[PDB]
Amino acid sequence: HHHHFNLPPGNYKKPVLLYCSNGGHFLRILPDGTVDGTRDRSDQHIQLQLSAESVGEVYIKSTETGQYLAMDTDGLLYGSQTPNEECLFLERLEENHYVTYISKKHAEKNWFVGLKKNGSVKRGPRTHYGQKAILFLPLPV
């Protein structure tokens, strides 16, 4: 395929917080489908549950609202009420430590889930290997 296959510790038993090392925000999916980041560890919308569709492919869903993280045709993240092709991400280890999530639908273009230092999500085309915005550390709740 288009990417390596170094995988991070596999465990989707319980929910996690996706902490972004670039700014230290937790990924958040709001009820209205908006996706962004917040530093508030107590936010009810940052608790996420990952599940593996195929080895190395995951869905990322809000435990509070049931929404699936998804990246659209123009690279914007949104919360989807139902699982679709835009909701699958390739979960990969990076720098032998961090976890990156690559849009499966747009894998050939290297579009990643990423957060800026100001807490706003990055648009797919603006992401790329080597950025700090793409580096996550899932924290078990």
Swiss-Prot record:
Changing residue 122 to A: Loss of LRRC59-binding. Heparin binds at residue 22. GO terms for molecular function: fibroblast growth factor receptor binding; growth factor activity; heparin binding; integrin binding; S100 protein binding. It is found in: Secreted; Cytoplasm; Cytoplasm, Cell cortex; Cytoplasm, Cytosol. Its main location: secreted. It holds the Pfam family FGF. Keywords: Acetylation, Angiogenesis, Cytoplasm, Developmental protein, Differentiation, Growth factor, Heparin-binding, Mitogen, Nucleus, Phosphoprotein, Secreted. A motif (Nuclear localization signal) lies at residues 13-16. Belongs to the heparin-binding growth factors family. Plays an important role in the regulation of cell survival, cell division, angiogenesis, cell differentiation and cell migration. Functions as a potent mitogen in vitro. Acts as a ligand for FGFR1 and integrins. Binds to FGFR1 in the presence of heparin leading to FGFR1 dimerization and activation via sequential autophosphorylation on tyrosine residues which act as docking sites for interacting proteins, leading to the activation of several signaling cascades. Binds to integrin ITGAV:ITGB3. This is Fibroblast growth factor 1.
